């Protein structure tokens, strides 16, 4: 059993990544109201705790942080302000879990569209790092592989 958490600001692609990993957009209908909605077997079972849709409810991310074992800090390369928002979420994990180090992955979503990029690759590596895309299936599975290793 493993519990992984997806974090980030609104309009970043959190829900798109979650669905695209557990099942897949279009190929099958997505029911988020059943027991195995966010669970996928890879040989071990993973549960994705995504904060998408519940960002205004701070208690929701805190609950997911306490129960989480791996963390995915996601931002958009088309949105300048979204990379800035990651510093707070980073420190909040160490605060809720009350630990020195936490297994986490840094994710730069929406890497498929370059003609709208305002956030270069530069900034990511300095703070593992991936440039992924949910709608283009780039590095979707890879994100959640790192966390199980860590």
């Amino acid at each position: 059993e493993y519990k992984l958490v997806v974090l980030g600001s609104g309009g970043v692609g959190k829900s798109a990544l979650t669905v695209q990993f557990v099942q897949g957009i279009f190929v099958e209908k997505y029911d988020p109201t059943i027991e195995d909605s966010y669970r996928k077997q890879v040989q071990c079972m993973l549960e994705i705790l995504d904060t998408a849709g519940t960002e205004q409810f701070t208690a929701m991310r805190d609950l997911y942080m306490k129960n989480g074992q791996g963390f995915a800090l996601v931002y958009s390369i088309t949105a300048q302000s979204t990379f800035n928002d990651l510093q707070d979420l980073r420190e909040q994990i160490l605060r809720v879990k009350d630990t020195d180090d936490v297994p986490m992955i840094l994710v730069g979503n929406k890497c498929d569209l370059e003609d709208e990029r305002v956030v270069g690759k530069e900034q990511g590596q300095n703070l593992a790092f991936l440039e992924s895309s949910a709608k283009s299936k780039i590095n979707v599975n890879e994100i959640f592989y790192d966390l199980v290793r860590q």
């Binding site: 979650t18 549960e47 849709g53 409810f57 701070t58």
Partner: protein, 627 residues
């Protein structure tokens, strides 16, 4: 051979059956079927011939009795208001939809040429042989363009289609029989609720008018008058269900109100003339904390960088563009203002001109600012945003846990009932796509945060350790009573307030708490377990009877993932499967409110909370209470 095929089922010989079967292997419409089915069909397929082109096989609206296969010739598919929509040729089959779904004929079948031969299977023979094995899909085409897709999920249900065809389908299949009242309304509910996404009133109302006046092109004078009457009856039924969904929200829609006005006159004029609609006419006549409307006007304060403000008078559903305009009108501007939300914590969000009804989307202590873009980074929060500096224990400590929880639940229910089902739809699909407010949902969702931060505020403002232990005990008690009233929302809000980093830190306070309440809380916190899609909560809420308030953040999550996880359109057709899923979630809210729920000072406190929502301040306060 055709004489053989003219013989009734129980009159064909063994050699007759054996020779018919041999020929059925050449018919393409039957080739996917088993030998078992084909052998049974050999004793059931009736041969039918008609001489003249233009002969009507059956009318749209008639009850279905037979399934047909074309041996020779061709037919036209005729729908009222559209004419010839499709042509069928040698090898093709039709008339299965009415038989399987127990619905009226969706179209008329008219002979296209002279001398057409058919194979026919009657109703009861079709049901025992073909119904269970026929096919999973029916694709309806009009002008060689995909228009409706029906599948087995047992009947063929709508999976996808054009807005016009989906409307046509749900209009046609309405059952007027009084004993089928709830079944009819239940079937229509998905369309009536979800039409705002794929067929707004601007398109729906003219389509409704056109359907109401659409006369039949086939049949005797009596058959035609009977169909048109029943057509009109079904349109009225749909209109009534449509109007009921909106309720008071019709006042926000000029097109919808103008439609109803003229529709009522049309129906009443037809009622007088035809002596009909005796039950439905008075129903239509009736239609022709309190919930906030989009048209309501608010006095709202928009702040300048120097912390002065303008008071604007605008509608609740006003766009940011309209807000900017109202501010500019008072300050006399031409300096390129932008609207920005600011937290008590100082973090800022720039709003697009596109955004509608933003007033209620603010955080508990959020404020709205108007400034040129170069001022964005220099903006700083107001003192008013930073919350109280002295607690209110001396007031609510004198109040009972049961009294507080009850007044909380009463207030919560007033806020919950103010939320219209459609606000859930507008919130999910994007507020700007409808130009409608979600103010009521906005305020009820914020209430979750208000209760959560109330707990943290009072604990962090309580300097005495002994009194602080008393607070923890009281909050656990209030939470327990909230769960008793089936107010799960406020229950989780208190539990999560206790879970907050600033409160859980207080080891000396938790340690000194009686083990009776320590285990009580651990049981509460275990209900929050996110495991197996919040299974612990899911089962808890399912066992309860239907006067309850659900865990709202999870509902919003369900709605979000239903939207992002599914495409609204597939191949330019409306994905009605998705629409059905959204409607199911909304109906769950309808189920929770389907039953009613059963001390001015206690009422006053609960409804007028002053809260710190600045997490930094709360942590700093907690760090000096217990270093």
């Amino acid at each position: 051979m055709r004489m053989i095929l003219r013989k009734p089922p129980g009159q064909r010989t063994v050699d007759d059956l054996e020779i018919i079967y041999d020929e059925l292997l050449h018919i393409k419409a039957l080739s996917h079927l088993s030998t078992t089915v084909k052998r049974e069909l050999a004793g059931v397929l009736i041969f039918e011939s008609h001489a003249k082109g233009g002969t009507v096989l059956f009318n749209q609206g008639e009850e279905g009795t037979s399934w047909y296969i074309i041996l020779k010739g061709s037919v036209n598919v005729v729908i009222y208001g559209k004419g010839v929509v499709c042509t069928l040729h040698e090898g093709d089959d039709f008339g299965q939809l009415a038989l399987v779904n127990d619905a009226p004929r969706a179209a008329s079948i008219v002979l296209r040429e002279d001398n057409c031969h058919f194979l026919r299977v009657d109703k009861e023979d079709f049901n025992r042989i073909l119904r269970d094995v026929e096919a999973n899909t029916v694709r309806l085409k009009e002008h060689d363009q995909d228009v409706l897709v029906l599948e087995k999920v047992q009947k063929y249900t709508v999976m996808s289609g054009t807005p016009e065809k989906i409307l046509e389908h749900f209009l046609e299949t309405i059952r007027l029989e009084p004993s089928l009242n709830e079944a009819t309304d239940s079937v229509l509910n998905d369309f009536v609720m979800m039409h705002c996404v794929f067929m707004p009133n601007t398109q729906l109302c003219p389509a409704l008018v056109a359907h109401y006046h659409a006369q039949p092109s086939q049949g005797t004078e009596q058959e035609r008058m009977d169909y048109a009457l029943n057509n009109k009856r079904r349109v009225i039924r749909l209109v009534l269900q449509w109007a009921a969904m909106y309720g008071d929200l019709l006042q926000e829609d000029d097109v919808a109100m103008a439609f109803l006005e003229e529709f009522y006159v049309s129906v009443s004029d037809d009622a007088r003339m035809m002596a009909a609609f005796k039950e439905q006419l008075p129903e239509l006549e009736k239609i022709v904390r309190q919930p906030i409307r989009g048209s309501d006007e608010v006095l709202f304060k928009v702040y300048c960088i120097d912390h002065t403000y303008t008071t604007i008078r605008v509608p609740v559903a006003a766009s940011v563009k309209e807000v900017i305009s109202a501010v500019a009108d008072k300050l006399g501007s031409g300096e390129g203002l932008i609207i920005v939300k600011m937290n008590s914590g100082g973090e800022k969000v720039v709003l697009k001109s596109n955004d509608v009804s933003v007033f209620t989307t603010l955080t508990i202590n959020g404020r709205l600012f108007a400034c040129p873009r170069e001022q964005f980074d220099s903006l700083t929060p107001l003192p008013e945003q930073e919350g109280p500096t002295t607690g209110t224990v001396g007031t609510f400590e004198l109040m009972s846990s049961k009294d507080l929880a009850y007044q909380m639940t009463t207030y919560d229910w007033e806020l919950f009932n103010c939320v219209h089902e459609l606000e859930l739809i507008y919130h999910t699909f994007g507020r700007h796509n409808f130009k409608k407010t979600t103010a009521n949902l906005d305020l009820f969702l914020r209430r979750f945060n208000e209760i959560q931060f109330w707990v943290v505020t009072e604990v962090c403002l309580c300097s005495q350790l002994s009194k602080r232990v008393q607070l923890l005990k009281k909050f656990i008690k209030i939470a327990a009573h909230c769960k008793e009233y089936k107010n799960l929302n406020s229950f989780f809000a208190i539990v999560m307030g206790l879970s907050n980093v600033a409160v859980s830190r207080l080891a000396l306070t938790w340690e000194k708490l009686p083990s009776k309440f320590k285990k009580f809380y651990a049981e509460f916190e275990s209900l929050m377990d996110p495991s197996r899609n919040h299974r612990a909560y899911r089962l808890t809420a399912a066992k309860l009877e239907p006067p309850l308030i659900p865990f709202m953040p999870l509902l919003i999550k369900d709605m979000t993932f239903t939207h992002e996880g599914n495409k609204t359109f597939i191949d330019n057709l409306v994905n009605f499967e998705k629409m059905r899923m959204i409607a199911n979630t909304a109906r769950t809210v309808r189920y929770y409110r389907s039953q009613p729920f059963n001390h001015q000072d206690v009422r006053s406190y609960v409804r007028q909370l002053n809260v710190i929502d600045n997490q930094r301040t709360l942590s700093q306060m907690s760090h000096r209470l217990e270093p």
